């Protein structure tokens, strides 16, 4: 079969930068290449067909080139809403490349840290969930530890992160500490580290 | 308007079968090759199968050959995928996709793969369908910063995906972060959806989360308060 490859596999870049994404075919496919944009949670959208024809109503900052074996997609001036995974596809036997995930670079922004204890309603059925929320930070890298009556936790917390916000290019993050009602009758603290905080920060509550 | 409406996705035991369907409208269905494409959680797009306008040629990816059967009914403007002997690798979102026009060989006035269906989820598992529990994330001194408070809903212990969440029936979009679901060791999914709003609005506004888990026929509204 025809194998499609892409490089780099991820890249971060500032608003206004020129970005160049490369796609490669294992053998010659002439100009039979398409490029797709996929935003998380949405269906893929055709941007370029026949290597360089812009699909209708796609902004003019997108362009494609190449014929044969090596191909590029160029975003001439990157915008906050261009955050996505970009896939090439050979247009003869329909096979896709593995995608390039584009992230928007912006100024460092420390998270706002909020904490929520279990609801009364939940407690009633013998399980307790403590949720810590890091809101509207950049970059994506962060550290959240759980302490209970000062005792540091392990294995009993899961994290989730949103996609980049399409206006302000920030991330948010939930960490959820799971414990039984039993164990929870025993000061609960979420401790956060991040490039935007001069030193770590701790949100906590009692009981 | 040109559309592809999918159905038939759901939960099925490993080794068992499901039929996907896709109803076309707004274009001359008879004139177009048609395709299926899938995407496994957090992974890339994979072409699955295609079929010519008159069904005289059919193609499959190597990973599905012998287990999947594509077909169409032009009189009903419908495209189907019969999936048998389902396994882990087939767990994915499945897209109905519009191909090349029979008349436009060179695509001088037509472009292939321009119109996609919304997607339909296939889950391959012996585990049970289970509705979520919906718990409030109440705004407090410890979820406030200057002129903003954060509140939300915890949507816990459902299978399979998906679940949807809105706030005040779509009338509140700004400041909403609905987190991607994570799989808990127990084998059930859970997520939170939060929203930040003016702290002074806590007195004037009502904040309700609308949770819908179609696989289990569960709709829940939870009002959340200080």
Numbering used by the authors:
A (entry chain L): 1 to 186, 189 to 209
B (entry chain H): 1 to 52, 52A, 53 to 82, 82A, 82B, 82C, 83 to 100, 100A, ...
Please give sentences taken from the publication describing this entry.
The principal target of these antibodies is the primary immunodominant region (PID) on the gp41 fusion protein. The PID is an amphipathic 15-amino-acid region that separates the two heptad-repeat domains found in the post-fusion conformation of gp41. Cluster I anti-gp41 antibodies, including patient-derived 3D6, 7B2, and F240, bind to the HIV-1 PID region (HXB2 isolate residues: 596–610). 3D6 has a near-germline configuration, and F240 and 7B2 represent anti-PID antibodies that have undergone affinity maturation.
In our unbound Fab 3D6 structure, CDR-H3 is mostly disordered, suggesting some intrinsic flexibility, however, primary sequence analysis using DEPICTER19 does not identify a region of intrinsic disorder. Of note, this loop was ordered in the previously reported unbound structure of Fab 3D620, allowing for additional comparative analysis. For 3D6, the CDR-H3 undergoes considerable conformational change suggestive of an induced-fit mechanism of binding to the PID. Residues S100A, G100B, S100C, and Y100D from the CDR-H3 loop are disordered in the unbound state. Upon binding to the PID, residues 100B to 100 F extend to form a β-hairpin in the bound structure. The CDR-H3 loop moves 2.5 Å toward the CDR-H2 loop wedging the PID into a pocket generated by the FR2 C’ β-strand. This movement breaks the π-π stacking interaction between the aromatic rings of VL residue W32 and VH residue F100E to accommodate PID residue K601. In the case of the anti-PID antibody response, the Fab 3D6 structures presented here support the notion that these non-neutralizing antibodies can rapidly arise from germline B-cell receptor (BCR) configurations and bind to gp41 spikes using preformed paratopes.
